[PDB]
């Protein structure tokens, strides 16, 4: 706690916070856990005008060497007064974000900075990769019923999902193209993508080093219950650099790329905080290891 | 439509009004992008490649220069968890439009990427670390921190961390535990009470447009009005303001600054979408002009 060189931002109850904290302890580095979730009520943060004047529970933390950013963060208070509650959350979150922005400015290697949030915007992240020579699904974010009917008339079998996440993907069928609900794009835009058929592959990239590429297939084992099987795989070096270009162009140090397979893969999303324990166990592959490696590197 | 100069805001906005009428006075009709009417009365379509941006069928892949003025009740009281998600979907699409343009090479006059460096607890640190004078400040939820700050600094003020309320002066009743201990609900910004003259410096593309002193005069019973009159600043200060605008990453900027007890300036804040109409008049400065000229210069 007096050695704030490596900071893990997140709750000690979070599994990945535990995994990274332990995997670092095993290498002789006891990280500082910045439990943001408990900030205003049971922790103090104080900022001076000088960038270095950052104080957490009285202790100064001007510039960590590296930060693993898992999360920054009884809400019936919203059901009471939404406006006050929103402004208060904004005060909270502004202070925390300022802490992390100051660390990045001072020179801390934040593993996925909160700046990349801009370049993670789905409709922009895709266009970013696409206009850089990367394969992506024929996509379409719209609020026009007619626009999507031409999208359908062109690409045929396709699906729809939320623009910013918040619901599981649903296959677009003809009853959705009905004037009953296709007019409801009036209330909010929707993402429509072509229906890719090949396999789901996930590629971890940590500081311009493809750590692995894992296949995720499913086996149906019970009534409406299926389980994933992860398989360590090797990838064309062309794509083991095509990926690295995506990570560096979006601005992520540690990323989990999501590709889906024609018979050749296309990039769907880069994840600014992908989990790993699921894959770490379903294919006995190591990701926490290289993450801790990259973290302890910045201390030298 | 000639989508080389786009003005994002509502035609009812007096500022987009000024900018559009100035651009017209110079041989360009902008495409006003009234984004209030996004969900309902307007269609936007984005494809996988960045050029495929369509507003009402008409595509707008790459303007020369954007002037961003804004990007934008009971539906909340009823169901709040879905209202927020709906607003976020609309907002994400609009922001993707703006980011795509900037990535093409559009001169977005103040991009939304600035909203990062805009946050006061980081912007003041940026300016302070670059050697520019900022006021002594403390952003905190720590009553002991506030007590030490008040003792160190003297007269203080407190304002929200991200704005939203009139700043008030710190009094002893506020340091009483009754009030002070409410800092556990959300943090607060405390600052030294600067006691000088309000000054505002306008900067477009690393050129200082003018510097205006803002005073107030009592015209009616408990009613004041602002008098905004021009002053001259040294080339020293002019270069500092240009550097501050560049540090925060803004093209059009109205810098709020202020003398203190010493008659020397402190940058208070840099606005990412400052107004200018109330300033141009009595000062006989023209800001709308230089802004429109800078816009046309990108075409």
């Amino acid at each position: 706690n007096l050695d704030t060189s490596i900071v893990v931002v997140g709750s000690p109850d979070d599994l990945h916070v535990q995994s990274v904290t332990e995997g670092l302890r095993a290498r002789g580095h006891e990280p500082y856990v910045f439990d943001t979730q408990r900030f205003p009520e049971e922790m103090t943060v104080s900022l001076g005008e000088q960038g270095a004047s950052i104080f957490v529970d009285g202790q100064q933390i001007a510039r960590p060497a590296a930060v693993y950013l898992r999360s920054l963060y009884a809400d019936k208070a919203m059901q009471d007064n939404w406006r006050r509650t929103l402004l208060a959350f904004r005060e909270r979150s502004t202070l925390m974000s300022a802490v992390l922005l100051r660390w990045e400015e001072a020179g801390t290697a934040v593993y996925n900075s909160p700046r990349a949030s801009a370049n993670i915007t789905k409709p922009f992240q895709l266009a970013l990769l696409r206009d850089a020579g990367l394969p992506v699904p024929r996509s379409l974010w719209t609020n026009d019923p007619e626009a999507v009917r031409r999208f359908h008339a062109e690409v045929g079998d396709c699906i729809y999902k939320p623009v910013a996440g918040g619901a599981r993907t649903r296959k677009l069928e003809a009853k959705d193209l009905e004037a009953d609900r296709i007019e409801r794009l009036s209330a909010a835009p929707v993402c429509f993508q072509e229906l890719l058929t090949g396999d789901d592959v996930r590629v971890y990239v940590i500081d311009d080093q493809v750590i692995c590429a894992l296949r995720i297939v499913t086996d149906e084992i019970d009534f409406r219950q299926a389980e994933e099987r992860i398989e360590a795989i090797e990838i064309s070096d062309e794509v083991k650099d095509q990926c690295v270009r995506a990570a560096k162009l979006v601005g992520l140090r540690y990323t989990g790329m999501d590709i889906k397979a024609d018979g050749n893969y296309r990039v769907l999303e880069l994840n600014a905080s992908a989990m790993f324990r699921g894959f770490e166990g379903r294919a006995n592959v190591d990701i926490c290891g290289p993450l801790c490696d990259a973290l302890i590197a910045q201390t030298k | 439509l000639d989508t080389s100069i786009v003005v994002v805001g509502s035609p009812d906005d007096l500022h987009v009004q000024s900018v559009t009428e100035g651009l017209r006075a110079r041989g360009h009709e902008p495409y006003v992008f009234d984004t209030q009417r996004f969900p309902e009365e307007m269609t936007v379509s984005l494809g996988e490649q960045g050029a495929s941006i369509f507003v009402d069928g008409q595509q707008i892949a790459r303007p020369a220069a954007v002037y961003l003025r804004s990007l934008y009740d009971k539906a909340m009281q009823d169901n709040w968890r879905r209202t927020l998600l709906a607003f976020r979907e609309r907002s994400t699409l609009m922001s993707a439009v703006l980011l795509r343009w900037e990535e093409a090479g559009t001169a977005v006059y103040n991009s939304p990427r600035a909203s990062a460096n805009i946050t006061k607890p980081f912007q003041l640190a940026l300016l302070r670390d670059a050697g520019l004078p900022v006021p002594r400040s403390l952003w905190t939820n720590d009553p002991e921190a506030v007590r030490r700050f008040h003792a160190e600094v003297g007269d203080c003020i407190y304002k929200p961390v991200a704005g939203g309320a009139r700043t008030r002066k710190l009094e002893a009743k506020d340091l009483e535990a009754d009030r002070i201990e409410r800092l556990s609900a959300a943090p607060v910004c405390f600052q030294e009470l600067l006691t000088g003259d309000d000054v505002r410096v306008y900067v477009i593309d690393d050129q200082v447009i003018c510097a205006l002193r803002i005073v107030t005069d009592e015209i009616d019973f408990r009613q004041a009005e602002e008098r905004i009159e021009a002053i001259e600043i040294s080339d020293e200060v002019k270069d500092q303001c240009v550097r501050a605008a560049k540090l925060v990453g803004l093209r059009y900027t109205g810098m709020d600054i202020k003398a203190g007890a010493d008659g020397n300036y402190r940058v208070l804040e840099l606005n990412a979408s400052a107004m200018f109409r109330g300033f141009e008049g009595r000062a006989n400065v023209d800001i709308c002009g230089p802004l429109c000229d800078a816009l046309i210069a990108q075409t």
């Binding site: 729809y160 999902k161 939320p162 918040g166 619901a167 599981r168 649903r170 609900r181 409801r184 794009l185 209330a187 909010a188 929707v190 | 879905r82 998600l85 709906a86």
Partner: peptide, 5 residues
């Protein structure tokens, strides 16, 4: 439009 939201 998306029910699960």
């Amino acid at each position: 439009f998306i029910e699960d939201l």
